[PDB]
Amino acid sequence: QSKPWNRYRLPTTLLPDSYNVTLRPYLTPNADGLYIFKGKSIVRFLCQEPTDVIIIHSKKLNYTTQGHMVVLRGVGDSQVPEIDRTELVELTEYLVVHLKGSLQPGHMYEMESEFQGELADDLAGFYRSEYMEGNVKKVLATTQMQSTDARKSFPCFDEPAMKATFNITLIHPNNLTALSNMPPKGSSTPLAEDPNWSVTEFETTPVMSTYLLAYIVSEFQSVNETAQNGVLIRIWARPNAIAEGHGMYALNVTGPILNFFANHYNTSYPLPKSDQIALPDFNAGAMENWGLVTYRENALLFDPQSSSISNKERVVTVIAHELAHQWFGNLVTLAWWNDLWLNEGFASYVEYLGADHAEPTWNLKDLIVPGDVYRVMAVDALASSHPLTTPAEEVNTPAQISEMFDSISYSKGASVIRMLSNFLTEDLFKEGLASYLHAFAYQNTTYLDLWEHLQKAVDAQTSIRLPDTVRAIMDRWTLQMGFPVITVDTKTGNISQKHFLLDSESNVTRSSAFDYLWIVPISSIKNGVMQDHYWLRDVSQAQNDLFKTASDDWVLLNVNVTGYFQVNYDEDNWRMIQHQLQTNLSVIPVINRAQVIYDSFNLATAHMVPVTLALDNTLFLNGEKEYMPWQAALSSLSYFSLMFDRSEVYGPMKKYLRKQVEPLFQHFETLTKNWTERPENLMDQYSEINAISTACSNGLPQCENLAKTLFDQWMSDPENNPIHPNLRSTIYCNAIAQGGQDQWDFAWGQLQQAQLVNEADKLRSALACSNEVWLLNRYLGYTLNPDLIRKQDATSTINSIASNVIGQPLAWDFVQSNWKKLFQDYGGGSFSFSNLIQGVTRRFSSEFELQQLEQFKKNNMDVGFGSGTRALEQALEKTKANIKWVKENKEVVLNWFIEHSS
Amino acid sequence: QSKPWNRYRLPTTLLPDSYNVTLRPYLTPNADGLYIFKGKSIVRFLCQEPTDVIIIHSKKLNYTTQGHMVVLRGVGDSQVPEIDRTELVELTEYLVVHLKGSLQPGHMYEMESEFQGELADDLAGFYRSEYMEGNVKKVLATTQMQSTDARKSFPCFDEPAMKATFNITLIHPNNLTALSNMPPKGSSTPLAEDPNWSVTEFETTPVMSTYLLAYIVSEFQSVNETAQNGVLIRIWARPNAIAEGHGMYALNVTGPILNFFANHYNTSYPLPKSDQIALPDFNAGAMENWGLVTYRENALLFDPQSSSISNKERVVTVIAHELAHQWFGNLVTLAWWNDLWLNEGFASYVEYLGADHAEPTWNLKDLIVPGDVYRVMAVDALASSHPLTTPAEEVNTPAQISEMFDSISYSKGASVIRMLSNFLTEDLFKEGLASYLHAFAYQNTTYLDLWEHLQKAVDAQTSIRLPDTVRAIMDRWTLQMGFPVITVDTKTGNISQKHFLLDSESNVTRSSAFDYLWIVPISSIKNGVMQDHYWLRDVSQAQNDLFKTASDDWVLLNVNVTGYFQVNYDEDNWRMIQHQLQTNLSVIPVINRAQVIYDSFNLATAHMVPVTLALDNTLFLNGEKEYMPWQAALSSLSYFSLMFDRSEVYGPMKKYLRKQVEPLFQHFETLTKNWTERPENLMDQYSEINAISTACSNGLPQCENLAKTLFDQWMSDPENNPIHPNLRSTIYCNAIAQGGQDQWDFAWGQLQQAQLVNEADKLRSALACSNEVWLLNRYLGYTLNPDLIRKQDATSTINSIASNVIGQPLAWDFVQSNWKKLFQDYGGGSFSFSNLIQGVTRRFSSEFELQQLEQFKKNNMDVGFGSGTRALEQALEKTKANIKWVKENKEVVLNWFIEHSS
Amino acid sequence: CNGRCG
Amino acid sequence: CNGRCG
Numbered sequence A, B: 001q002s003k004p005w006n007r008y009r010l011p012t013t014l015l016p017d018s019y020n021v022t023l024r025p026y027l028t029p030n031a032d033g034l035y036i037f038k039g040k041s042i043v044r045f046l047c048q049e050p051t052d053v054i055i056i057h058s059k060k061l062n063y064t065t066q067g068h069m070v071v072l073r074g075v076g077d078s079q080v081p082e083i084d085r086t087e088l089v090e091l092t093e094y095l096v097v098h099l100k101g102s103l104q105p106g107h108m109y110e111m112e113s114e115f116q117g118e119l120a121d122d123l124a125g126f127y128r129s130e131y132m133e134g135n136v137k138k139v140l141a142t143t144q145m146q147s148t149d150a151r152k153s154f155p156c157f158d159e160p161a162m163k164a165t166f167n168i169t170l171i172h173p174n175n176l177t178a179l180s181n182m183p184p185k186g187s188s189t190p191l192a193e194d195p196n197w198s199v200t201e202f203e204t205t206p207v208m209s210t211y212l213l214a215y216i217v218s219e220f221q222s223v224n225e226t227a228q229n230g231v232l233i234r235i236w237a238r239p240n241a242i243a244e245g246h247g248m249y250a251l252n253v254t255g256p257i258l259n260f261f262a263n264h265y266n267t268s269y270p271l272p273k274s275d276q277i278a279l280p281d282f283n284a285g286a287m288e289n290w291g292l293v294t295y296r297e298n299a300l301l302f303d304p305q306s307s308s309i310s311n312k313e314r315v316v317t318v319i320a321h322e323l324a325h326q327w328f329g330n331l332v333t334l335a336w337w338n339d340l341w342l343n344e345g346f347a348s349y350v351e352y353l354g355a356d357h358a359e360p361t362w363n364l365k366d367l368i369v370p371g372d373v374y375r376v377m378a379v380d381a382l383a384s385s386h387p388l389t390t391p392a393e394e395v396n397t398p399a400q401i402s403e404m405f406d407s408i409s410y411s412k413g414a415s416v417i418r419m420l421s422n423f424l425t426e427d428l429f430k431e432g433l434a435s436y437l438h439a440f441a442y443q444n445t446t447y448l449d450l451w452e453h454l455q456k457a458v459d460a461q462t463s464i465r466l467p468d469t470v471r472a473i474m475d476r477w478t479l480q481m482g483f484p485v486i487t488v489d490t491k492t493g494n495i496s497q498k499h500f501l502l503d504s505e506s507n508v509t510r511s512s513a514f515d516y517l518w519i520v521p522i523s524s525i526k527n528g529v530m531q532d533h534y535w536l537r538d539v540s541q542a543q544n545d546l547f548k549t550a551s552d553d554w555v556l557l558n559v560n561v562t563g564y565f566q567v568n569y570d571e572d573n574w575r576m577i578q579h580q581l582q583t584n585l586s587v588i589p590v591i592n593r594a595q596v597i598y599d600s601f602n603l604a605t606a607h608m609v610p611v612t613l614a615l616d617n618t619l620f621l622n623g624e625k626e627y628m629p630w631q632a633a634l635s636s637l638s639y640f641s642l643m644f645d646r647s648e649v650y651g652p653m654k655k656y657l658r659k660q661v662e663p664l665f666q667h668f669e670t671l672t673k674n675w676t677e678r679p680e681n682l683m684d685q686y687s688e689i690n691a692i693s694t695a696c697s698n699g700l701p702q703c704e705n706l707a708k709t710l711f712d713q714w715m716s717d718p719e720n721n722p723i724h725p726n727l728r729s730t731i732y733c734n735a736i737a738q739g740g741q742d743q744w745d746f747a748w749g750q751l752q753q754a755q756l757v758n759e760a761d762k763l764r765s766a767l768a769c770s771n772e773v774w775l776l777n778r779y780l781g782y783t784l785n786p787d788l789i790r791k792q793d794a795t796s797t798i799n800s801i802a803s804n805v806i807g808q809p810l811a812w813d814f815v816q817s818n819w820k821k822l823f824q825d826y827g828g829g830s831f832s833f834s835n836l837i838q839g840v841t842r843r844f845s846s847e848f849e850l851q852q853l854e855q856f857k858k859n860n861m862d863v864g865f866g867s868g869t870r871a872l873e874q875a876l877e878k879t880k881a882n883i884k885w886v887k888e889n890k891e892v893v894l895n896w897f898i899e900h901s902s
Numbered sequence C, D: 001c002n003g004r005c006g
């Protein structure tokens, strides 16, 4: 009985067939500095059920249509009812056309409108972006429709399943270039009413979703290539970026990635061209618009001269991720936002596969484990987590839709899909994947459709046998939150599962239909030899001889952490794994060498092993040369450093880390020919970066020596930076720490003239490493000056200063003191008080510091705390948990480091 | 009508003639750990006026006399009245003997008592002192009567004018030594009631004051010498101290100092022997008991191997000071405590003369200027100051008497007496001094008696002419507080005086009978040539051509700062003095090179010159080799460092000081033959100490180099410390700052085994120089542990940590956090919250820090703040004054240092 | 979208 | 006395 225009979901009575859309951005503002765009559209739709109302989305559009807000016509010889009135309903973002009679099923109608909106600098819908070319401020027009902003650019049935073809036309200044999803139909032609403008028409899109449309007017230039099949590939950027060669790496990898996916998906790339564009400051990162993918510049462009290898890794993975969607997400589209996790989780997994194809020597696939698996496990091991799936009827408003785009959706999505591919086998997974894409091309699906297609492939073969249906298995991993710890007693081979929470005193109140039991694929290795695969059924406890060991035998579960779970053992089997790692580490796969560390520190947090057992698992690192296990140790120990770097625990901690890292430092010293040439592949470059960072930050004299020499050498010849980009962040930081105002002032001058964001970021970060109080305070004083520190870098800089053990009280005092830069930083920018608060309070671990934080909060009465309001409550609760952890752990940890630092 | 026993001053009706006193300390406590002494005394006194009451002092004595508390007899054939009753009146510290009839004028009486008191560890009266000899705890008995504690050891007429002879006997364990003012009469004899004890009787003292008595029972040993006139000189100390040779320097200087004073005073040393004794932890410093001077050990003993030159200076000056009193104070005694300033001020001046005699190459006399003159001017340039003189009738209670012993009495006393000697001439001063001592030997005086004798010498010659009587001149300097700034306009030769206050907004409410006008002796030098002497009369303004300059001429007043005043000039004459100092500094006496600095920074504080003019007066220091002017700069600038060392001002400040000190550092480097041999005389050694300290603390790479090399060398050979004691405090501190836990732990081990207080102090101080937060916090954690840091060193150590710019917030947090070590440190020791508060809050100069301090004070409700209660109010007011000064000065000072650091 | 999405 | 006196 509620009126349909007060419901958030569209009626199903009318479905779109095709749209004409003409947009005209005005890149010169009016007298008051208002920028607008104008548009005209015609939507052709079909009546499925009789209705006397048309409901279509519209947001922030003013209508200038002759008569009512629309004109309505019948297609062919269909009669059309007269319009009664048109109204806009802001809450549900609709244009509502009330008719004097009913539309008729089977008939098609055309609805024409003319409209205009602000071309705002708001990164939503059709919007403007401003950037500098030297003396000059440039302004371009571009789009971001995802999720519910297509309706902010033209009236449309703005739900992803309501697919249609689109004929786009841009009217633009005649010396600019216009781009959209499809190629232009031909040359631009002059606008007859004013030939300073031109008209660019684009070929008709395939049937597609509104959230994937894009159109862009700019001065950008491209580098290009024509693939063997005739697909034109272009990378677009600012003219100066193109001329500097910054588009080349993206161009290099794009062809191979597209080829890999066409093969992987058993489906031709569905469009005639691929454009990718680098936009200055695009806050969303990247967006997979079909045929015209947008990226933040620094994510797509690459400067070999000044960029690190991790930087390069980001380019190729971000590209692989977006290109993945050109089939999965765009060709076959999930019917509703509640299934976003499947689209984003799938892309978040297969980005590693596409990237690996482009860079096959880098072993990129391994990176999903620290990058996504352990990352998301940190938040999925909380009582406040949520299942991957959400009922569709609970996801209605644009705010509810936006909440779907979180860590769980992307990273747990990737993790469980990777698991599924693995227990299926890739070949079988790819077979059902192809079957799904072929059956649903240009249509819409739910996750159940993918499971059904995977089930079809399973049922068509005899080799891979499952303990249940694909759906029943995946239901355990998608309908309930969290994941299990699998615990093995190797004396008996008994194996158990329970819902893993980091906080052992947590009360879980979200109920599960499965009582937090999973069906779990368990690979295992015994004395370095793969064993037969095992499935744990939906039981708390089971037994198998696979997990039963002889006294000199060791067993280890979840090879390469393909399964979304963590593993604990009895202490004896732990000691055996330890012995192995100490005596021949190569017998255990590198990812599992990392797993042992990752898992045991989490288990210690949850009180399932002693903290000393986790520490014991780092003892092998003195002989470890590879990236991942060292990364596991460093990630798991940053909290220890945060908690203890002001205490008597720190001496022995640093001493221990120096001992462990010295042989690695030495190794690279020789391997790199005295640091003159980098290791060859990515993982080894990453290992070297970490080794140097660890050596320097823990006070290894030989690392300090290297940093001073290199920075001294740079200062004596500023135009020839002798420091490879991989090593800059450490070398800069350590040399600044060791030096005084000469190094600091030099780095400041370098910062002030840096042209490249990444180099500027490293300098800003390294400037916070000074051990002079006065330089840190002077630096803090600069953070609020937009002439010296960009406002968008202010909080990040303060946090870097806070990270310095000496800068901790300076930053904290500065923040409390200047808190009333909130009455000048909520309505004129965001700032991010939230991140600032977290950063500056991160160390707090005493009742004394807790009392201070409470007293600061007592500037309540007015001022409040805007967008980090509770980023302050979180700080109080975090500090309490820190006080408690430090109290339980201080003694034990102290004595362990003393005991193990020689 | 008030009863005389309720009045604080004794009657004048009875005067003592002579005393017998026998004291017996019991160095073994009873079962409950109570130590006592027993005594018996007989006082013979004469009746001047009839009275039926005897009032004598007694404090904390229990009487065990047969009958009443005393027995009273007539001398010779005098009858005596019967006693009615005896009572003790605690408030006024009297024993009151009420008689049944009157004593008769002209008759002598003997009053006998037997008594006992606690031999407490309270440093007052006859008291015990505990110290270790290895495994063993030793206990000795010693005395401190000054001011009103003779009455705590035996009943006596305990006022300094009531002089008498004393026959002392000590009853003591037979294997210990007994000492008193006079030599023993002969060998000790066994106590017949228990021959484990012996009896030592001493020769009769001269007529003397009760506050100068002493007697000591100990295991101490001596080194000795017999002077040419037969006076036996001995230095007494712990057996181990004597055997290590620590008594030798004191012995070396004592003979020459006694000879100098006998000549200076034109009066033979009035006793047959001189004993001086080094007591462990004697909190009063030194006490001039006639024939038996007591010192804190570390003030009398000297270890050449480990002691600095400043250390040596302290020994010889402290000895000269105490020996000075053996005539001035002890032979002629000021009648009442209100004239304490004359006794202590005189000794505080002539200590430099006696010491100079013993060390004639050291130029010690100059040291009174920074040591006493400018020191006391800091507190005498306050509205809250007080005149040297106090009416005798306002000084009654023991607390009122104790207030006489302050900086004004000692240091302004010294300053004005030095002035007086100078304008008289030493020869004439010494003539009246002799006349005074000869006229009043063994009697009592007031300051007016000295003036009268000086006037007699003036009147007996024709050379020195004064503008008024000695008394009228000295009245200006003794009856009103403070001192004038003398201001000269050299264009006209106009000269003015006004009462100088550091705070130009201060209201002076203490009235002066002279309207804060003085009669002022003014020496002057013009273009490096002495001019005729001038006296400014009691006028605000005068004119003389002595002070009128030609445009290229300069004039400078108060040669060697013999006058107790500061001097300002017009800017032109300042610039001329500056030019001179830059072009040939040697034309201006070294003390005046310092004066220009001292005076101008004070004038800047009081807003009489710009702060940049004071700074301008340091520009000459790059060519200055001598101690004093550099000391003036360093003293005047420590506040600038305190205020600015966390701010953007510090870089340019350090840069400026590096520039100024480098040529001096270089000079000593060559002069000392690469730091292998010290400069010859004291002032140059002091200059070298300061140069190194300044170079190192301001970051001169060559100083840091030296410190690291020397400490590295020490660490490689711990038993052979290669660092001369003069340089240790800097070298230790800088090397610890540069290093990490290796240097810190090494210095900590050295501290834990140090046998010598002075070396332990330097280590404790240097340990606070670490630039590692964690080491500073670990160190702070040690301060409350008596096993690691003596309680008496706790607050001092925390303050050293606070002095470190990095240790500032750590110490402040520690103090706030641990403030509830007040409910464990007021009744079990003092601690000195006062000094702690001052030290930790010393830097505060922002509204933010002021708010923190207020919030800390808000742990008011209970706990309070004991003995530093207001040392907290002072902190609030000081911080406000700091906020204000920093606000007015920051910009100007910043730009001056930038401008002058090249 | 990838990065900061809504 | 000299030093800390009363």
Ligand SMILES: *[C@@H]1O[C@H](CO)[C@@H](O[C@@H]2O[C@H](CO)[C@@H](O)[C@H](O)[C@H]2NC(C)=O)[C@H](O)[C@H]1NC(C)=O
Binding pocket: A036, A037, A062, A116, A117, A118
């Ligand atoms: C859309 O229409 C609205 C309302 O007509 C415009 O907003 C108004 O602008 C006027 C004049 O600039 C101001 O007085 C008001 O602030 C606005 N009125 C209301 C009711 O909000 C808006 O600018 C139009 N937008 C475009 C792109 O043309």
Ligand SMILES: *[C@@H]1O[C@H](CO)[C@@H](O[C@@H]2O[C@H](CO)[C@@H](O)[C@H](O)[C@H]2NC(C)=O)[C@H](O)[C@H]1NC(C)=O
Binding pocket: A248, A249, A252, A302, A304
């Ligand atoms: C894009 O690919 C090309 C071709 O493989 C890479 O070109 C090489 O660049 C390196 C580094 O300067 C030179 O050693 C070679 O001479 C180049 N090879 C060829 C065939 O030209 C290029 O480096 C790639 N760009 C990026 C950013 O990775």
Ligand SMILES: *[C@@H]1O[C@H](CO)[C@@H](O[C@@H]2O[C@H](CO)[C@@H](O)[C@H](O)[C@H]2NC(C)=O)[C@H](O)[C@H]1NC(C)=O
Binding pocket: A262, A263, A265, A266, A267, A268
């Ligand atoms: C889709 O996959 C199919 C099935 O595997 C591919 O077709 C096979 O291609 C190979 C290549 O020579 C032939 O030998 C097989 O006989 C083919 N099988 C069938 C059933 O035709 C096909 O090439 C893939 N298509 C795309 C577009 O990738």
Ligand SMILES: *[C@@H]1O[C@H](CO)[C@@H](O[C@@H]2O[C@H](CO)[C@@H](O)[C@H](O)[C@H]2NC(C)=O)[C@H](O)[C@H]1NC(C)=O
Binding pocket: A015, A161, A162, A163, A335, A440, A443, A444, A445
């Ligand atoms: C959403 O997707 C479904 C497919 O999963 C579409 O339904 C199919 O439509 C095709 C071709 O138009 C028919 O041949 C099939 O029989 C349909 N399959 C069904 C109903 O399961 C559906 O049309 C899409 N929804 C919208 C609004 O386009």
Ligand SMILES: *[C@@H]1O[C@H](CO)[C@@H](O[C@@H]2O[C@H](CO)[C@@H](O)[C@H](O)[C@H]2NC(C)=O)[C@H](O)[C@H]1NC(C)=O
Binding pocket: B036, B037, B062, B116, B117, B118
């Ligand atoms: C002096 O006399 C007083 C009082 O007779 C003694 O102090 C008393 O000691 C007793 C027993 O030790 C305790 O009950 C009390 O604490 C004290 N009583 C009073 C009234 O204070 C004191 O010890 C005597 N002193 C000496 C040196 O003999």
Ligand SMILES: *[C@@H]1O[C@H](CO)[C@@H](O[C@@H]2O[C@H](CO)[C@@H](O)[C@H](O)[C@H]2NC(C)=O)[C@H](O)[C@H]1NC(C)=O
Binding pocket: B248, B249, B252, B302, B304
């Ligand atoms: C006490 O005086 C003596 C005699 O003047 C000083 O003795 C000299 O000591 C130095 C330093 O070791 C040697 O160079 C000389 O050989 C000694 N001279 C004589 C005559 O023995 C002694 O140093 C003085 N003590 C102190 C602590 O200053």
Ligand SMILES: *[C@@H]1O[C@H](CO)[C@@H](O[C@@H]2O[C@H](CO)[C@@H](O)[C@H](O)[C@H]2NC(C)=O)[C@H](O)[C@H]1NC(C)=O
Binding pocket: B262, B263, B265, B266, B267, B268
């Ligand atoms: C006290 O000072 C007097 C007076 O100056 C000293 O006596 C003089 O001593 C010299 C030494 O030879 C004689 O030449 C003079 O004739 C003496 N004058 C008189 C008046 O006697 C005396 O030596 C000093 N006494 C002491 C104890 O220091």
Ligand SMILES: *[C@@H]1O[C@H](CO)[C@@H](O[C@@H]2O[C@H](CO)[C@@H](O)[C@H](O)[C@H]2NC(C)=O)[C@H](O)[C@H]1NC(C)=O
Binding pocket: B015, B161, B162, B163, B335, B440, B443, B444, B445
């Ligand atoms: C305090 O000192 C004065 C001297 O300033 C003493 O008075 C003198 O006593 C002597 C010798 O005993 C007489 O010959 C003088 O005539 C006195 N001079 C005077 C009275 O000015 C006085 O006795 C001392 N007071 C005490 C209590 O001893």
Ligand SMILES: [Zn+2]
Binding pocket: A288, A321, A322, A325, A343, A344, A347, A348, C001, C002
């Ligand atoms: Zn994506």
Ligand SMILES: [Zn+2]
Binding pocket: B288, B321, B322, B325, B343, B344, B347, B348, D001, D002
């Ligand atoms: Zn004295």
